[PDB]
Amino acid sequence: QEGLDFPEYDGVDRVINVNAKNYKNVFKKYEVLALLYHEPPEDDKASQRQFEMEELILELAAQVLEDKGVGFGLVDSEKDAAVAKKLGLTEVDSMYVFKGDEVIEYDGEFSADTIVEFLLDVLEDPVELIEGERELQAFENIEDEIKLIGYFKSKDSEHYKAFEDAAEEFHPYIPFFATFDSKVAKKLTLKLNEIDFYEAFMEEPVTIPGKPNSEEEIVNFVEEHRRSTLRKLKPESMYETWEDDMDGIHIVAFAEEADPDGFEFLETLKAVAQDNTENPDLSIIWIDPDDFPLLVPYWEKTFDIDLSAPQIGVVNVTDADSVWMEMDDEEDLPSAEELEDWLEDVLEGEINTE
């Protein structure tokens, strides 16, 4: 209770419809503005209470973040079509966050805490500094996300400023790090103004060519290397990741990292992904079921799998049709060779959902 009191919605109306009349003043009122771009709801009671539930979630987030200068609004895809075209709102059910000169699309779990955590991340500065051996270890501990790190003279360096400009383009989904510490740069093998790109779960980085790097060179490189061989599904971006597949067919690996059997399978998956990381056609989404408890019974019934054991399979996003690697039980995990056999069969189409 005292010192540990979750906020409860006070009923004050803070999330309003944004339209051609007020959108210019609403932007002036709030330093950071989050606009949910939505289609008009249907009269169905299941979709009626659904839409009212969404706005109340934004109402709680608006209350929690009021003092930090964050505002929330709603934009109707039909009623406010001219406003949506002017602002760049194009994907229904996405929430567009306006910070400075940037527009950030939120396409993640629509819950109050996930949205507030995301907005708190948006409020942070886009570049994290690294100085000393212990901060370097914190950088090295990052593995489940893409990361960049550059070595510059100081914050006054023109090349640091270009690095920060590029960081703003991907904020807050890709952490950018900068060091002015020559001893840190030496251990990372970074020469002056060099920037290293670390693919998720990869040990070895890729150095951005053509140093020093303009904002344009960094942004183009990151866009070219956007898709990791192994990606971890995260609530803040779960629908963006789920929708980011060419043929709507995912290789999905379920592994509970804290469980001994899940850990064993995760080791093999990471090693295979590392050994095959140059394959431009291989991409695997790792889901830790402990990150999505409300989806665990849904997954087990829809996929006909037991999520207390590791799994890897093929999922068709059209109708959740799926096929899974055969294991006798949790102790019959594939070797790296067996896993590589199975992935090659999936890429060739020999193993499929159809």
8 binds Ca ion (CB under 5 A): yes
For strands 127-129 and 176-179, give the pairing: parallel
In whole angstroms, how close is the CB of 257 to a second copy at the nearest point?
A: 9
Question: Where does this chain touch a second copy (CB under 8 A) — which range of 96-104, 136-144, 207-215, 218-226?
Answer: 136-144
Which amino acid belongs to residue 256?
A: E
Closest contact distance (angstroms) between CB of 6 and a second copy is 6
* Nearest alpha carbon to residue 315 among 327, 299, 294: 299
Name the β-bridge partners of 33.
Answer: 71, 98
Q: Which does 46 bind (CB under 5 to 8 A by kind): a second copy, Ca ion, none?
A: a second copy
By CB under 8 A, residue 290 contacts a second copy: yes
Residue 84 interacting entry, from a second copy, Ca ion, none, C-beta within 5 to 8 Å by type: none
Q: In the set 124, 203, 223, 275, which binds a second copy (CB under 8 A)?
A: 124
Q: Which is nearer to a second copy, 6 or 278 (CB)?
A: 6
β-strand partners of 75: 37
Q: What are 245's two structure tokens? A: 């597949």
Edge-to-edge strands of the sheet including 32-38?
16-17, 70-76, 32-38, 94-99, 102-106
Q: Of 14, 41, 55, 120, which lies in the binding site for a second copy, with binding defined by CB under 8 A? A: 120
The bridge status of strand 284-287 relative to strand 321-324 is unpaired
Closest CA to 312 of 340, 286, 336, 275: 286
Strands (E), the chain: 16-17, 32-38, 70-76, 94-99, 102-106, 127-129, 147-151, 176-179, 195-198, 206-207, 230-232, 249-254, 284-287, 311-316, 321-324
Residue 239 near Ca ion by CB under 5 A? yes
Per-residue tokens: 151: 């070595």
Instruction: Using the minimum distance from each CB to a second copy, give the nearer residue, 30 or 239.
Output: 239
Residues 35, 58, 83, 112: which binds a second copy (CB under 8 A)?
112
In terms of residues, how long is the chain? 354
CB of 82 vs Ca ion, minimal distance in Å: 22
193, 229, 241, 311: which one contacts Ca ion (CB under 5 A)? Answer: 229
| Residue 276 DSSP code | T
Cα–Cα distances (Å) from 77 to 24, 89, 340, in that order, read 18, 9, 45
Question: Are 80 and 88 in contact, with CB atoms under 8 Å apart?
Answer: no
Applying the rule CB under 5 A, the residues between 326 and 345 that interact with Ca ion are 331-332, 344
Question: From the list a second copy, Ca ion, none, which binds 247 (C-beta under 5 to 8 Å, kind-based)?
Answer: Ca ion
Nearer Cβ to a second copy (142/192): 142
* Binders in 180-239 for a second copy, by CB under 8 A: 238-239
Q: How many helices (H) and strands (E) does the chain have?
A: 12, 15
List 6, 246, 280, 326, residue binding a second copy (CB under 8 A):
6
Binds 347, which of Ca ion, a second copy, none (CB < 5 to 8 A, cut-off by type)? Answer: none
Q: Which positions touch Ca ion (CB under 5 A)? A: 5-6, 8, 13, 15, 91, 93, 107, 113, 121, 165, 169, 172, 189, 210, 229, 239-240, 245, 247, 249, 259-261, 277, 290, 304, 321, 331-332, 344, 353
Q: Which positions touch a second copy (CB under 8 A)? A: 1-8, 11, 46, 50, 64-65, 67-68, 109, 111-114, 116-117, 120, 124, 128-132, 134-135, 137-139, 141-142, 238-239, 242, 250, 252, 258-261, 263-264, 267, 290, 293-299, 301-303, 308, 315-320, 322, 331
